[PDB]
Amino acid sequence: AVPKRRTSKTRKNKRRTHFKISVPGMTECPNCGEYKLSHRVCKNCGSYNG
Amino acid sequence: NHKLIEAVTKSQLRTDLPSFRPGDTLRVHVRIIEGTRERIQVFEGVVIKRRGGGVSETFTVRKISSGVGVERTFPLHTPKIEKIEVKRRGKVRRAKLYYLRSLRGKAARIQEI
Amino acid sequence: TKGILGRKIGMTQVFGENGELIPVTVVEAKENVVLQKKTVEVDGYNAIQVGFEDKKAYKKDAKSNKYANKPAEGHAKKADAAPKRFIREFRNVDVDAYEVGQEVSVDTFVAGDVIDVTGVSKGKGFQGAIKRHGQSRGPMSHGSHFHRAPGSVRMASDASRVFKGQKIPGRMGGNTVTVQNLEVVQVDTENKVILVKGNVPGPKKGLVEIRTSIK
Amino acid sequence: GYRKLGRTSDQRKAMLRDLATSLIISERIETTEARAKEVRSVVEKLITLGKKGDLASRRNAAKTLRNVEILNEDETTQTALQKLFGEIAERYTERQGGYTRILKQGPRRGDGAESVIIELV
Amino acid sequence: MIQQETRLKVADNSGAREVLTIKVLGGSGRKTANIGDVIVCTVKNATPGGVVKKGDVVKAVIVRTKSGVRRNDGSYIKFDENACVIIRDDKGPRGTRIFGPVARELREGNFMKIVSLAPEV
RNA sequence: UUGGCACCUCGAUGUCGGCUCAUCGCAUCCUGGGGCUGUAGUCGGUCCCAAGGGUUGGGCUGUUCGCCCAUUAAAGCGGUACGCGAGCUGGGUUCAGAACGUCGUGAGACAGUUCGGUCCCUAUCCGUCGUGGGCGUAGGAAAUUUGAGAGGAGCUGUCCUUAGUACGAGAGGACCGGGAUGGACAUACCUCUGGUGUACCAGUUGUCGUGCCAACGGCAUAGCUGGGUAGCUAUGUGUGGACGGGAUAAGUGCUGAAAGCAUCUAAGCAUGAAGCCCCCCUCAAGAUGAGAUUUCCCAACUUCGGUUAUAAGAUCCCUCAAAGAUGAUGAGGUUAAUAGGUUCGAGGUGGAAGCAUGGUGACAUGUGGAGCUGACGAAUACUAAUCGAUCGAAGACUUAAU
């Protein structure tokens, strides 16, 4: 099938309400002092506790 | 092997039957009550399979009668088998003797110990 | 006018008095207590609440459903009992014969009782119309191009629309099902186990509701 | 099976044999998260075989290992079945299970695949 | 008997040798018959000398099946071929002999005459 | 239905039969309830009410139509663009080839017949089936629920007693009641019987490799063959359409005048169908008319007349399955048995390697019901669920009474 009518900019932007990405999900490393992903090793000094 | 199932069906198991393997001649005394009196019929044949289980174990026996093959399958713990004798022990190489269905006459004879 | 809660364990078989074979289901029903009594003067209808399986106590940093939370402890403190994770009501019983905080035993059911069983069916996922609704295939040869598409729900052209309640693919299973007119085979006092002749809806370790037959 | 890893039956078994062998040689490798959770069972059941030491245990482990040669030490060469039965199994005689540890790294460029580190405890 | 085109052997003393199922009696839409059922059939092979000839549409009853039957005590019996016996209208065999073992479920006050002649029940 | 007319469509509204058995009407084929009979009974004929459910498989023909065979309680008639080709086919009919009969001087046509002959499209909007997020329901939360409504199911045969009784010269042969067992359909489930079971066990052929023997590995459809765990399954195993109320349809009445008689009707009172409303099963408070019950949390700063984070609680992120396209749902996160590993089992296969004895040898016997084993039952913190972060209340106004 082919579209019957042109899609307006109002309808197009409504459809993109939920099209987006999320936050990485990061925590602070208490050896590096810098940010890292949860349950992943630090990348500054390469340490993983626990 | 659940704890509850094996604890309820414990009173159905019968510690009165002999030990047999697939491929031996065996006689089963069956209590038939077909009619107006209770008599005993005897079925004699060769054991061809025993698929395992607990109280739901089964076995199958095969015999030849007037040119027609017959299969009988009983539950091992049913209260309708009086007793069981082991006439002779055979020599087989597997657990399921399904190849006996296509063999008739001389080729269908199993060796002995 | 009696009911319990339990967990389905599996299927087995037992022998009858005449030597016949019947299939049975092993059901484990323990730790049943009475938690509340709703009356017409207060709630507008008579019923009793029953809890089935006891949880763990309160915890400061609990993360799962293993430990009871604060609101559930107050409800299980009115009647002296540990918090329960399965709570169901029974409208078929007479309230004045029951008292809040007493155990419900499998002895309430005797052998030969006629019961109905309620449970939740097993889930199958997203299924096609052949399996979900039990309709037929199209030809598999003779130049055919119609094998497993929906083939019994066609529509006309006058209405210019599709009617409601059509039978096309979707999610199947997971529904509330009742099986009526089952029979109690044997009750077990040491293991709190009941044997029900037949089969009941649901998977292993699923909750089942047992009542008396209404008809 | 357990998880098909996007391979046929013959390819899956050949790839688990290569990953398991290379882990004995270097004792620390980097791979994919999904692959690492299936290598666990393969390597750990090979260490159980090397802790028995019987001839039948040796011949049952030669059906999974590959014929590599390890000239890593400055002394005489040895294969990967001599190292499994000689050195690695020597230091695991006390602990029962859990000879493998997995550490997460993160997504990799161009694919987004989660990278992990797998090593012997 | 299982279908509308199943060919049956005949195990009595008459000219008929093989038959072909034409219909399964006992209800609208029924399409399977088992031991103890009556069917409408036709004769495809016969012997020279007998009351039954080729091309005759007759009634028969079922005595042996490869699919067998289940008792209400958990036992099964399964034969090695499919066989039938031609009968008169009043449940009576039109032959004088019966060959082969016969299923034990044919005695319920309905087919006593056939059971009497059977060499083995 | 065959026709009449020529109002939309020729910058295109795809034409017969079949697959499908969806949806509707009643002028009812079966079942349910009745009046009359040239209704003795068992069957019938004709008319009235009734649309709840049901209303087979084959041979011939491209066929619709029709004839026939074997059954059935019955094998109903019609509409839906002669229902349905962006769902399927392409047998027939109106493309290009070739042949027969007939017509024509001819190129060629059929009042006709025969063999062969490309079926395109990734779904924007409405509609239909499943499944999530936001806000609202005048504090914030966890559970349990009422049912305004809506949707399912609704079929029927054969035997045995009453009774060889009533009826009938006789042959024949019951209404009204009480039981047993089926056919078709629906739903749940894997204990039994089978199917499958590409990381389970065993046998065997060719050819490469592990330096050789022995023992194993790759390729040849999973090389082929015999079995088979969990899970998914029917042809397998259980269950249901039961018993009952209320008002009615056609009919049958009681008591009664208009109309001193008569009359079911004008007032008044009864009875009466598989049909209507309940009674059985499922969904259901976005039912904005947003319902009910039991529990839990509730303080500092202003004068901001209002904020604040925190409390109860729930997630981010990790180990998973009884759930699953994703997401949701459910079992867990060290104060821990959620998954992997280790140790015991169940079930499956069928007698491992090495060694000894016997044979010239292919092989056989013992150590030993051996060895091996995916999903199933237990125990065990040896590995991984670390440390952490985010959201989430302080309860508006009017009236009445205590």
Automatic annotation (TrEMBL), chain A:
**Keywords, ordered alphabetically:** Ribonucleoprotein, Ribosomal protein
Per the record's keyword annotation, is Ribosomal protein included, yes or no? yes
What's a single GO BP term from this record? Answer: translation
SUPFAM superfamilies recorded:
Zn-binding ribosomal proteins
Q: Which InterPro entries match?
A: Ribosomal_bL32, Ribosomal_bL32_bact, Ribosomal_zn-bd
Q: Name one GO cellular component term.
A: large ribosomal subunit
Q: Which domain of life is it from?
A: Bacteria
Q: Does the keyword Ribosomal protein apply?
A: yes
Molecular-function GO term, any one:
structural constituent of ribosome
The Swiss-Prot or TrEMBL record describes its family as follows: Belongs to the bacterial ribosomal protein bL32 family.
**Which NCBIfam families does this UniProt record tie to the protein?**
rpmF_bact
Q: What is this protein called?
A: Large ribosomal subunit protein bL32
Lineage start: Bacteria, Bacillati, Bacillota, Bacilli, Bacillales
Gene it is expressed from: rpmF
From TrEMBL, chain B:
GO CC annotation terms, alphabetical: cytosolic large ribosomal subunit
Molecular function (GO) terms for this protein are:
structural constituent of ribosome
Tell me the InterPro entries matching this sequence.
Answer: Ribosomal_bL19, Ribosomal_bL19_CS, Ribosomal_bL19_sf, Translation_prot_SH3-like_sf
Keyword set, alphabetical order: Ribonucleoprotein, Ribosomal protein
BP GO terms, sorted:
translation
* Spans through the membrane: none
Assigned protein family: Belongs to the bacterial ribosomal protein bL19 family.
Briefly state the protein's biological role.
This protein is located at the 30S-50S ribosomal subunit interface and may play a role in the structure and function of the aminoacyl-tRNA binding site.
Name by which UniProt lists this protein: Large ribosomal subunit protein bL19
Source organism per entry reads Staphylococcus schweitzeri
From TrEMBL, chain C:
Q: Which domain of life is it from?
A: Bacteria
Q: Which UniProt keywords apply?
A: Ribonucleoprotein, Ribosomal protein, RNA-binding, rRNA-binding
Q: Which GO terms describe its biological process?
A: translation
Record Pfam families: Ribosomal_L3 (PF00297)
**What one GO molecular function would you report for this record?**
rRNA binding
Which residue stretches belong to region Disordered? 129-155
Matching entries from PANTHER family are given as: 50S RIBOSOMAL PROTEIN L3, LARGE RIBOSOMAL SUBUNIT PROTEIN UL3C
State the oligomer form and interacting partners: Part of the 50S ribosomal subunit. Forms a cluster with proteins L14 and L19.
| Entry-linked NCBIfam families | L3_bact
The protein in question is named: Large ribosomal subunit protein uL3
Origin organism is Staphylococcus aureus
Taxonomic lineage: Bacteria, Bacillati, Bacillota, Bacilli, Bacillales
From TrEMBL, chain E:
Q: Does the keyword Ribonucleoprotein apply?
A: yes
Tell me the Gene Ontology biological-process terms attached to this UniProt entry: translation
For this protein, the record's PROSITE patterns field holds: RIBOSOMAL_L14
GO molecular-function annotation terms?
large ribosomal subunit rRNA binding; structural constituent of ribosome
Entry's Gene Ontology cellular component terms: cytosolic large ribosomal subunit
Source organism superkingdom: Bacteria
Q: Which SUPFAM superfamilies match?
A: Ribosomal protein L14
Q: Does the keyword Transcription apply?
A: no
Annotated InterPro entries: Ribosomal_uL14 (IPR000218), Ribosomal_uL14_bac-type (IPR005745), Ribosomal_uL14_CS (IPR019972), Ribosomal_uL14_sf (IPR036853)
Question: Which key words tag this protein in UniProt?
Answer: Ribonucleoprotein, Ribosomal protein, RNA-binding, rRNA-binding
Subunit? Part of the 50S ribosomal subunit. Forms a cluster with proteins L3 and L19. In the 70S ribosome, L14 and L19 interact and together make contacts with the 16S rRNA in bridges B5 and B8.
**Stated family:** Belongs to the universal ribosomal protein uL14 family.
PANTHER family given in the database record:
50S/60S RIBOSOMAL PROTEIN L14/L23 (PTHR11761), LARGE RIBOSOMAL SUBUNIT PROTEIN UL14M (PTHR11761:SF3)
Task: Summarize the protein's role.
Answer: Binds to 23S rRNA. Forms part of two intersubunit bridges in the 70S ribosome.
Name recorded for this polypeptide:
Large ribosomal subunit protein uL14
Organism of this sequence: Staphylococcus schweitzeri
Q: The organism's lineage?
A: Bacteria, Bacillati, Bacillota, Bacilli, Bacillales
